[PDB]
């Protein structure tokens, strides 16, 4: 289930819960990544790069969607 929550706006942090709360270093790291990812074009004039963005590890896994300047992240087990 849900291990934590993060939502960003305009690049800044708007809301946070769980493991993701009070973690600036993670916040900006995820923001950096998301921005990079959003800048990904398969072909010329190919938007949007993704509907869903995930980053999976051993036990944790981050799930991100982007809507406007608002970015939504969850931390999950498995």
């Amino acid at each position: 289930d849900q291990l934590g929550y993060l939502v960003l706006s305009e690049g800044a942090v708007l809301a946070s819960s769980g493991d993701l709360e009070n973690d600036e270093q993670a916040a900006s790291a995820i923001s950096e990544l998301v921005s990079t990812a959003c800048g990904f074009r398969l072909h010329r004039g190919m938007n949007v790069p993704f509907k869903r963005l995930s980053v999976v590890f051993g036990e944790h896994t981050l799930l991100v969607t982007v809507s406007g300047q608002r970015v939504f992240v969850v931390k999950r087990q498995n």
Partner: protein
Amino acid sequence: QHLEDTMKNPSIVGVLCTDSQGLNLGCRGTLSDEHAGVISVLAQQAAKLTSDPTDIPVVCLESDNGNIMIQKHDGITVAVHKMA
């Protein structure tokens, strides 16, 4: 490695290998030199989200135009485009 098998895989429509250095280390199909840098960056960035050296971080762009899966391995980054 499994790399060869990835390359030979007809379910995968693009693949690209690279380094922390962002050089094109071998591509195929829909992925090409242009994407090296970005994939590199992506992988390096995701690896900054774990402290466990045994983790193989994986970045996964899910898209209606096929999925892109990027694994950060030690010494090499593999990106794979699946027309799923």
